[PDB]
């Protein structure tokens, strides 16, 4: 829980030899034959299916995030999670994904066949509209589910600094937002209000963007999804701060050079009541390389106007947006390894979230390791310690 590798590493691979104090060892020497050496780690605390506190629950959930990757990269812990991934972790995760991908097909088809005329578009009485009715209900089931599972985590695993962690702290919010935002739409589709739709549309785009949670079952896609969010933090906000700051600067500067419609009712010659707003979009399209200058030219001072837009392109496209590519290259180079290590925390958290969701007898069926009589203890009573074999080779210590 406190992130102390030197003692933590020492305790696990503790091999004492003298006959009295051999019950204190946690790394045995099962068998050897020339240059191949088996070894047998104790999982007494590490893996306890339900009926005890365990180191592995603590590390993956309640510990220091600064070195948690070095803690999950020691002797059984790496191969103990990989073993769970084989048995149940991989499988159950890939039921969770298709269960979710399907639920977002249903939330899609119900939106493409949601009517658009009249206060609440109830009038079902039809095989199609009853099929749509299966859709909205399955949807609301997910919303109330994701709502309770997150508030279950309120009286359970929540309240670290879960707002910007790359270790599911981000998605706990967005599934909550998805959960709230389906409930509100369900409330307004029943309370008459016609903005059930607008509130739904956000929920849909938000929901597919939650399928990036399910890129955690592959280092390939999961490391990628981590770099998206870091770049979104370390690189894109500082870019929009400046970019916005320029934009109000030039836009106000450029609106000032257009004659009012107190003159002849034109936008492309005159300016009135929407001329600021559209420039923000044109000056947005313009830096994105997506809109054309197409000089307005209906201005008191036309040549100052053109000199400014060119300084907007040079600064915002040629210099800021291509610097933005450059900064990403510095980001992805810096946070690649750091993103490999987060994923290992993501992946491990995924396994135990599945495991904890099982009843205890099922966790004991998938119990990892093998029972062993490592030695003799009180009044000759053996040591019935579950353990985890790790075969090894050194062609040096004959």
């Amino acid at each position: 829980k406190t992130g102390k590798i030197g003692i933590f590493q020492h305790i696990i691979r503790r091999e004492v030899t003298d006959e009295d104090t051999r019950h204190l060892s946690r790394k045995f020497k099962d068998w050897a034959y020339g240059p191949v050496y088996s070894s047998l780690y104790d999982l007494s605390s590490l893996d306890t299916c339900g009926e005890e506190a365990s180191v592995l629950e603590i590390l993956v959930y309640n510990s220091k995030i600064e070195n948690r990757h070095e803690m999950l990269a020691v002797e059984p812990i790496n191969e103990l999670l990989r073993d769970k991934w084989r048995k149940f972790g991989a499988v159950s995760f890939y039921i969770n994904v298709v269960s979710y991908l399907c639920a977002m097909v249903i939330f899609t088809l119900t939106a493409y066949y949601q009517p658009l005329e009249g206060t609440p578009p109830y009038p079902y009485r039809t095989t199609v509209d009853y099929l749509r009715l299966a859709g909205e209900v399955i949807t609301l089931f997910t919303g109330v589910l994701f709502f309770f599972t997150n508030i279950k985590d309120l009286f359970m695993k929540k309240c670290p600094g879960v707002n910007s962690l790359f270790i599911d702290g981000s998605f706990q919010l967005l599934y909550f937002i998805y959960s709230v935002l389906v409930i509100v739409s369900a409330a307004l589709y029943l309370a008459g209000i016609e903005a059930y739709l607008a509130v739904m549309v956000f929920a849909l785009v938000l929901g597919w963007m939650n399928a990036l949670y399910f890129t955690r079952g592959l280092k390939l896609t999961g490391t990628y999804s981590i770099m998206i969010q870091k770049i979104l933090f370390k690189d894109l906000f500082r870019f929009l701060l400046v970019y916005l700051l320029f934009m109000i600067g030039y836009a106000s500067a450029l609106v000032s050079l257009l004659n009012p419609c107190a003159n002849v009712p034109t936008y492309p010659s005159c300016r009135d009541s929407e001329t600021f707003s559209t420039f923000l979009l044109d000056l947005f399209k313009l830096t994105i390389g997506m809109g054309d200058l197409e000089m307005l030219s209906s201005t008191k001072y036309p040549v100052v106007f053109i000199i400014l837009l060119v300084t907007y392109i040079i600064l915002t496209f040629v210099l800021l947006l291509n610097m933005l590519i450059a900064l990403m290259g510095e980001t992805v180079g810096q946070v690649s390894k750091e993103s490999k290590h987060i994923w290992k925390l993501q992946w491990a958290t995924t396994i135990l979230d599945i495991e904890r969701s099982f009843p205890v007898f099922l966790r004991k069926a998938f119990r990892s390791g093998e029972m062993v009589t490592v030695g003799k203890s009180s009044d000759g009573t053996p040591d019935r310690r579950w353990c985890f074999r790790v075969d090894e080779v050194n062609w040096s210590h004959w």
């Binding site: 034959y33 020339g34 240059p35 191949v36 075969d391 062609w395 040096s396 004959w398």
Partner: protein
């Protein structure tokens, strides 16, 4: 398994020696089974062929390896058990399948010298295991590309190869194709 007294003596050897063995062997000729006594197929499907000599060598026990051969036991027993197969057959330690192929592959120059120029019997450096693979074929099977491994592989590879030139001044032992052709160089490639 099929284990008898003599393995159990050697497996539970301590401090480099154990004086039970010369007596159980002294008792062996009284029963008249030395041939059959230092010879046994553990018929375990993890130990199909292991003998007391395979045990005598892997324990780095020179004193008894000189012994067990002296009473004329075997130096050609094919340790064919699934344990004694390559790691891709579902095994742990391939060394060839022979005591001479072991003593080489287990970094024991003294045994390997002895087993050849020992009086009673001697394993020729030509003998093929149940894959065709001789000792040099087997040194290519255990060599990883590490410093310590590649060191003592090349020494003994030379040693036997230079040594087998003295004897049998004929076809090079490095030319002995195995049961898929591949010579020790082709087998390394």
């Amino acid at each position: 398994t099929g284990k008898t007294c003599l393995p159990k003596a050697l497996l539970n050897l301590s401090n480099g020696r154990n004086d039970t063995i010369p007596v159980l062997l002294d008792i062996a000729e009284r029963t008249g089974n030395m041939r059959e006594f230092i010879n046994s197929p553990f018929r375990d499907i993890y130990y199909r062929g292991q003998t007391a000599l395979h045990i005598a060598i892997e324990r780095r026990c020179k004193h008894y390896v000189e012994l067990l051969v002296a009473q004329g036991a075997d130096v050609h027993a094919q340790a064919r058990g699934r344990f004694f197969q390559p790691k891709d057959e579902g095994g742990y330690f391939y060394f060839g399948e022979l005591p001479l192929s072991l003593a080489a592959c287990t970094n024991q120059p003294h045994i390997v010298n002895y087993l050849t120029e020992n009086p009673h019997k001697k394993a020729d450096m030509r003998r093929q295991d149940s894959r065709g693979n001789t000792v040099l074929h087997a040194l290519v099977a255990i060599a990883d590309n590490t410093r310590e491994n590649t060191k003592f592989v090349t020494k003994m590879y030379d040693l036997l190869l230079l040594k087998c030139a003295r004897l049998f001044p004929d076809s090079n032992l490095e030319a002995v194709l195995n049961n898929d052709g591949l010579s020790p160089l082709m087998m390394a490639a």
